[model samples]
Target: SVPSQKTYQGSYGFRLGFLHSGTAKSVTCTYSPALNKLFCQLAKTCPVQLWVDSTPPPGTRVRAMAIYKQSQHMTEVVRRCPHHERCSDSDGLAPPQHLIRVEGNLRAEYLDDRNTFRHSVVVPYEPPEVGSDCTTIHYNFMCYSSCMGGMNRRPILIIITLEDSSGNLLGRDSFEVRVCACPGRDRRTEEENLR
Candidate 1:
């Protein structure tokens, strides 16, 4: 009743991982095979916080990669994120934009798995930049490549976004992770499928 710890690691067969605090916000949902498609390479931080960060470069820790559209139903296609800009160009025609859905005043909602983007739709977040002229509240998650395959039957949903940094909508929490366990279809043998 207690077994779930193994986020991710190369080769697309089992995909799912996200966390912030535990520090592992998922990266590399890779699988190209010469641009066949399925991608992610996320890291975005540096909207002028400290004083030493560059383009696609934030003191070295950066952007989201999930524009998946290889053939539709690619598991991510939500737009409009304040010029958040996406497109890692992995043979770009489209397939680089992992996850970051904040439309207006930043709205992060989840309508599935019993639904609970809750806190009663909690809002009002502006406590990261309180003093010392320092700021931070960036945590994200999203990985999709094994939908209904194996590997804990794959379903990793680890999210915590209390968006704040100009675009505010503070309140979002999610955790749906079950490492691995999908191989139990015997039907009491039934003569082992009557062979």
Candidate 2:
């Protein structure tokens, strides 16, 4: 297995626009302090926005991808290896095991009345298999971060990348998300448990 491109660093030209509350397509979100990640529900569609700060070169396009979260133990193990120099999910450094195929299209809307332009990609509902924990270290070098201390949910990484028509990388941004069936209910349980 080769190293996945999930560890790319983001640039200043583009950023992820996370909506807490807004008029346009917005997904209700909650923050987990223990995980330090934003969580959204699997049952609903999450509209991810791309904040284009600088004018991109002509023919630039945006795309989204998903990768299962890696185990922290594996990260620590790789970091102690001086031979590797940097973290690459390759060569026994814990290559990405589970990859989620994000099936969706990029939607665009141009509102003349409001004079607003919106570009959002909707993450459709994925089954519980895609929501199963994949961040905690388990037996056989597996990673699983149980949702609400159970197997009903999981954490995954969503990377939104921008590229030119020639497929040259322009900018990248990632979101650590927990895809659960009931985000609001599970969030309350998680907060209580954490406290």
Candidate 3:
């Protein structure tokens, strides 16, 4: 028998915003086809904002989870953490042993332009817990071997789940991100010590 055509067709249209270099305020992120992720040079203890393009049903609640994985394109050359110079000593072949957990506070606001209410969530500033003397990567530094984005260099997937008041699933959406000194394509052109 032929397979059923049933497939999910809901639109959450996930959007993300975070702080980065050369910007006094947080900026919205754009998708990267090559990296399959959004670029962000995270601030020290940076708080991230997540929103949806469409409004959800009334009484809907939201939750978030950050997922990690090793990169398929692992390279022999280790990653470079410009800010946290000491962390560059670790090998860039494996995923980080542990990652910081995340929690979000749901928020809603009325939008005059959209002619409806908009919903969003804010995840407070919390850096990764990669352990060792390397500490946490600062706003202006990059760590070559730090577990922040996993030395392997692939971005973490942040999943957003929507649920009704009774806890029934409504819809789900997600985005890929890298909280590092140089996220996305910028990593490829970074110089170790520019004279």
Candidate 4:
């Protein structure tokens, strides 16, 4: 038999990682209570380009081309790609040589009348400059949900993609999480029930 609703946890957070080039990298994400947004940061010792996007929401994507600065860079990264590749006419720096996509799914108890939970993705990155010895990089990811009343059974999935300069998908990553009501019976409660 399935456990009762009270046997579930209210919410849960899952961490995911990906391999950039030949190095295994993980992203650290956090929820912002003040701005009510998800923010992430990635600092690398080596110089490289990064791009992030999602496939579910249609057209919401972001790209950081040739990040040559070591300073902190922040942006509002969403689950949907904003536009198609080479869809823009802006002539400045040629589009990125490769694009990386990251996605995540969250499942938890449904609260109130809302059956769905919404979240945003933001990544602030500092790439290695022309000359630097920092070959190591750090990344963080954050998730913030909308107004969820109580807790119900919910499930989430995250997906990420890495592509070459020509928009060719080079690699992909995916993860999932589940949020539910808190567990009920304590140790004492379990003993009493068993008796």
Candidate with top TM-score is 2
Q: Point out the worst 10-residue segment of candidate 2 by lDDT.
A: 133-142
Which numbered prediction scores highest in lDDT against the true structure?
A: 2
Cα lDDT of model 3 by residue, 1-195, tens digit: 111111222465434444343322343223344444444553223344444556555566554434433344322222323333343332232122212222122232211113212112322212223562111111111322244433445544544555566645555655555555544334333321221
Query: Which candidate model has the greater lDDT, 1 or 2?
Result: 2
Candidate 1 lDDT over residue span 59-152, tens digit each: 2211122222222423433321322233343222222332342223243232211232211111233322445433332323222223222111
lDDT (10s digit) by residue, model 4, range 1-195: 110111111111111222232211232333222222222232112212232232212222222111101122112122212232333522222221112222221211111112212232222222324684222222221111121321111222333233333433334333322111111112223234546
How far does residue 163 in candidate 3 sit from its true spot (Å)?
Answer: 1.9
lDDT of each: 0.26, 0.40, 0.37, 0.24
User: Which segments of candidate 1 are over 4 A away from where they belong?
Assistant: 1-71, 74-109, 112-124, 132-135, 138-195
> How does model 1 score by TM-score?
0.20
Choose 2 or 4, whichever is better by TM-score: 2
Q: lDDT per residue, candidate 2, 1-195, as tens digits?
A: 211445343453466554453212233445454544555543234545555545565566665544445653222111112322232533232223222222232232111112221112222212123554211111011222343322223455555666666646667767666654445556666667878
Structural similarity to truth (TM-score) of each candidate: 0.20, 0.47, 0.39, 0.23
Candidate 1 residue-wise lDDT at 1: 14
**Deviation of model 2 at 128, angstroms:** 34
